[PDB]
Amino acid sequence: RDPKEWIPRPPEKYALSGHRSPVTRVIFHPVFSVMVSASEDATIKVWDYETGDFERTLKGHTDSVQDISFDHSGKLLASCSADMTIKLWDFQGFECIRTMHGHDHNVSSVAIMPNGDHIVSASRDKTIKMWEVQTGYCVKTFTGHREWVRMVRPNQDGTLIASCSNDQTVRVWVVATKECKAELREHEHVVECISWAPESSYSSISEATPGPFLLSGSRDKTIKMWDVSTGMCLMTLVGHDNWVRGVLFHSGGKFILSCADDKTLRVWDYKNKRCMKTLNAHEHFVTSLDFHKTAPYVVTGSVDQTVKVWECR
Amino acid sequence: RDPKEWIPRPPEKYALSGHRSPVTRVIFHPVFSVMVSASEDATIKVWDYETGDFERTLKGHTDSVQDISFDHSGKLLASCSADMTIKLWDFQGFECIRTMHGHDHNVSSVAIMPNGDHIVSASRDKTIKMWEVQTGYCVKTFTGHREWVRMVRPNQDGTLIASCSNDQTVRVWVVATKECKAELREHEHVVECISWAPESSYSSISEATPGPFLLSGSRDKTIKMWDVSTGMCLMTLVGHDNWVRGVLFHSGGKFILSCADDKTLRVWDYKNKRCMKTLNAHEHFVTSLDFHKTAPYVVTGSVDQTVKVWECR
Amino acid sequence: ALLKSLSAERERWEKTSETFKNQMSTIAGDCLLSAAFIAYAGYFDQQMRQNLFTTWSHHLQQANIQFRTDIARTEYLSNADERLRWQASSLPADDLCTENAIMLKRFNRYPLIIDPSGQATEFIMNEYKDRKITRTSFLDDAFRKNLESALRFGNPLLVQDVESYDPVLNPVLNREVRRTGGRVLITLGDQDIDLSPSFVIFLSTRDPTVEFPPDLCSRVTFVNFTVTRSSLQSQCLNEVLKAERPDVDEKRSDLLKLQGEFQLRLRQLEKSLLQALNEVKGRILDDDTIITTLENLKREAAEVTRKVEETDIVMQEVE
Amino acid sequence: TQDTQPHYIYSPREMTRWVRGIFEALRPLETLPVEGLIRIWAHEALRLFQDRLVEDEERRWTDENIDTVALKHFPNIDREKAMSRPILYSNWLSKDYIPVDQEELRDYVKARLKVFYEEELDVPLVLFNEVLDHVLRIDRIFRQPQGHLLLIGVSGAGKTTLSRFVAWMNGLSVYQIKVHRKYTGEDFDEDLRTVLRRSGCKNEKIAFIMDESNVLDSGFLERMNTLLANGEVPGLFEGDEYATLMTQCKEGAQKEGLMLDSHEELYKWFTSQVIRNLHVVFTMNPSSEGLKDRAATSPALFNRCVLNWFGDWSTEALYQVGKEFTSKMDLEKPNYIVPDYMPVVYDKLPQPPSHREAIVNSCVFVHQTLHQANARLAKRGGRTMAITPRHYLDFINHYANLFHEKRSELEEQQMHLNVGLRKIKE
Ligand SMILES: Nc1ncnc2c1ncn2[C@@H]1O[C@H](COP(=O)(O)OP(=O)(O)O)[C@@H](O)[C@H]1O
């Protein structure tokens, strides 16, 4: 069918087990029909979502890995952990590349903007470091956060960088001028996860009420979508009964997928602002989700030592 | 336009990727619009060339699948991989039906005659085994080569089969008399690819200079047209800069399609002895090609793990 | 009580955690020296081995590459358990034969042992006893059939009399291997023989003064079992004790064995305690398996306390 | 001259080879400028006047002489366009013998080696400029008729592997005599008659690879001398084997279409087929006495054979193979302080060198100091054992294995300790 209405349906497609510890972050590969998972036992396991078979494990970390990230080329792997380091992995040899240092606190987020030249790193040390790929040296350094930086995500064009911390704000920055172009104090609690609106979602958000747009999910019982042109909250999504943990956009740029601590996978809409399908996912709290850009697969990552894949119809 | 003047044009319509390993062979489906590719990772991926999107993945082998072929109806698929196995598949359910064992070494290619009740296969054990599709049994075994046989291929009525091997010979075998009809040796290096004259080209070759006519391409950067009856070559076509891996006719019976390891796709007219177009296919070696009987589409697998679709204009 | 018992482990665990950051930086240089020694210093005697190691260490110091200079080049490669197993299987206790056993265990090209004393032959026979090893010679008539049997069956083989080298082993030693999909196939003479993965071959020599052609010198690894001053001194001292003071010698042997067993059991304590406290899967204050670990820890504290009197009596015997 | 080395003989045969090399380089090319003419003149000059040399000083003298002679006899010319560093020519990337560049040549050779590993030899190979030059030289010799090779180099340098790769890619069929104990002249003659039957009657290309260690008698070298010089061995086929050879040769002539009768013209055609089809590659180790002995006992090996002096791997070769093998492992320290003494053993080292550059230079130094220690031990009076690039490859593989093993053990123990301390903190 058309990919504009791809919602996961009960029950799950594949129930993948084999993790000793809670699973932190799950992502899909751009070109290969394979996917990796990051857990709290200092391992990065890789699974084939098409057939549900275990491929191999990636053990080079000495502490729990928090976040992982790919690039557009699909050859370099990013991974940040609590061992004050981030590690690069290549997908042709499946081996360590560079061990990097420079953060004296736990690093909770890692990403690579699509140029494939440098890495962002959000850590507890109230700063974000700019580290390189081909060398592995610090060149630039973000400064201005005064609490634990939770999640960092670069915009699709790469000229804008967004970070959310625990001080009830989501301060976005500029990669070149080193300046926070829009800071606002409206959240009531800690903001957890952020995501970026694609080109397809740009026109949808424009006609809902130009761009770019931003979305943040926070512990204040509210999920809200941000705007950088006005620096104001455009709408607020309410209806989850617990702590929100993961949220993401759809491939067609019209739907929304979110997960919270009430064991729910609640899909919503902006035209009507009510949930047409609330689906139970796990027995314990839910951490992260991922939806494939070109495939109808939703993967659920949770702290229950089990990762599940769901099929979209 | 006219299938007489179907010629591919740059650039490609779609750049289909997703294989974890080099692509060996690509063929077209006769009835329903499917382009199915074989690779070095035991994955026979099914693609749709009409809209250029991924369709399904069929994993039945344990080692690199080499060549695939169809029947007269297109509902049966056969494949051969380095694990000494031939596998017969269907398209009404996309399910493996019967595995086929008995060869000593790597099976190199398989082919099904248009009657559909028998399948031939050439391997590294210097033999061609005459199988049957009904009960998965070997009727008998052809013998008489000296080295590894590259691929085998039958004629239109299924009574003459030809095969190319590493011993610089191309032997035609009679399915009726079980004996080699006219073995000819003229290529200086290893012959790799062969093809047969279509039903609507005998007059074209006769005017350029009955039959039957047999093509043969080798690694000495040459392509030769051979007449099976007279046991002598017609002429040698030069022009490739590296090893020739595939040769194929045209729907109009007037053109020759051939791809080589010189990272180009070349389409030639044999009337005036010369090459008429040199199409830059990939950034790596081109392994195979196939030509649609009723559509202006050409698919070319390669080593860089991409399958490209060209429109014949 | 639990915390008072476990502070003795915490006080060193935190120290090793701090040391790990520095130990990450010496890995490259230390492994460079170890690999150079294990692939290069085989044929040479003790003085030349030490000269080569000193030259490499001086170059690494001059090139500002940090290497762990307070470790033994054999203690870095050998574990205590495998050292105990080698000493049980008739290996001499000196560093030279320990390095030779290290090279025999960690070989890449198939080794060529040179043991005029005959110690390495019996060491290999005792070590590869579980796997069915077979002795043969290049001059033996039943050599090709035995080699075919070993290659087919995946059984270790020791070939004596390498002075009369039989050159059919060139594909085996060069590892010219054709991969039949998942199968492994190698040519040998006039037949194609299935090469099992669990197949090793050792070439033996009973004469130090043998000149080898450079092709064999390239194809095999030399493991020279020479005689050193410390080894001969220890052997003669042990023989003098056996002849003159038999009670002292036998109780020294018994106490050495007991000390080895005690150190083995202490290492077993450390491994068991670390793996048990690693997999508590909950609060340690709310379980009885933690009390079992405490009982194990106190019993092994008692035995590591009782090891001291064995150390004292060993000290009086050695003086 | 001949007193420096016994194989340093020069003759108008080399001028004839030079002229014909330029001839088939200009035969199908049909559009070339004077820059290209000078370039092919220089390339054939290098291939004919530099392969047999032993010392890098002599090789540098030859390169300087080519540059200065071309400059002197060709004024107002583009020196940079005419002569450059690689000066490589190949016919693999195109049907015509055209110049190629090192990067595309290396990519093509790596892809061809990936194809080649599956078919004959599944042993990995590392690419560098000497390997590229050697495979081009062996291909150039294999293309021409009656092309015989004499590769001079230390054992374990890869001579027969490069020859096998070139022979496989050129359609040659590799043949080795498979020597063992009790291998006599009768067995050698049986092997020679089998390979001669395959090369003449069956009309197939054969790269008759053989080694100095495979020579067990003077009859071996006498037969090789006669076969290299004449393309025939009189007295090899006697008795019923002569009749069998005549029947097979008549069958082969019938198969290839030529009408032959009697025995004289049949044997002459068989000799022509052996000349056109059988290639002999002879590999030995360099020696002051052995080279002179082979020059005395087999003039065909120094007259009818093209001599290539591989020698030992250079420091540049050792540096590149070490860098390529140690590229998949993490070796970079950002806080690395370059020492001011700068102990360098490979010239043209990047300045300032990084950590991996420094330790690969250290590996090259380790090989060099083993060379020096072996020389000192030999000079003292004790017996010595020759050192090979196989030892360097073994050392770099052991470096990789030990690095991975120690890193894995350290990370596992650190992770166990960290979880233990976290639980005791809880
Ligand atoms: N360029 C290279 N890169 C990597 N390995 C090589 C190279 N050349 C040779 N080797 C290794 O060295 C060995 C040389 O074997 P061989 O050619 O039989 O020795 P020789 O050169 O004495 O004939 C091969 O097994 C191969 O693995």
Numbering used by the authors:
A (entry chain B), B (entry chain C): 89 to 297, 307 to 410
C (entry chain A): 3477 to 3795
D (entry chain A): 2785 to 3210
Sentences from the paper on this structure:
Cytoplasmic dynein-1 is a conserved, minus-end-directed microtubule motor critical for cell division and long-range intracellular transport in eukaryotic cells. Cellular and structural studies have shown that dynein primarily exists in a pseudo-twofold symmetric, autoinhibited Phi state incompatible with movement along microtubules. LIS1 plays essential roles in the activation of dynein, including relieving autoinhibition and helping assemble the fully active DDA transport complexes.
To visualize the conformational landscape of dynein activation by LIS1, we incubated full-length human dynein with ATP and LIS1 at room temperature for 5 minutes. We identified three major species: individual dynein motors (Open), Phi, and a third state similar to Phi but with two LIS1 β-propellers bound to dynein, which we termed Pre-Chi. To fully understand dynein’s activation pathway, we began by analyzing particles corresponding to Open. We observed significant conformational and compositional heterogeneity in the Open species and used several approaches to sort out the coexisting subclasses. We obtained six different Open subclasses, which we categorized based on the linker conformation (bent, intermediate, or straight) and the presence or absence of LIS1. LIS1 binds dynein at four sites: between AAA3 and AAA4 in the motor domain (sitering), on the stalk (sitestalk), and, in trans when dynein is in the Chi conformation, at AAA5 (transAAA5) and AAA6 (transAAA6) on a neighboring motor domain. In monomeric dynein, LIS1 has been observed bound to both sitering and sitestalk, and to sitering in the absence of binding to sitestalk, but not to sitestalk only. This is consistent with a model where sitestalk binding is weaker and depends on cooperativity with sitering.
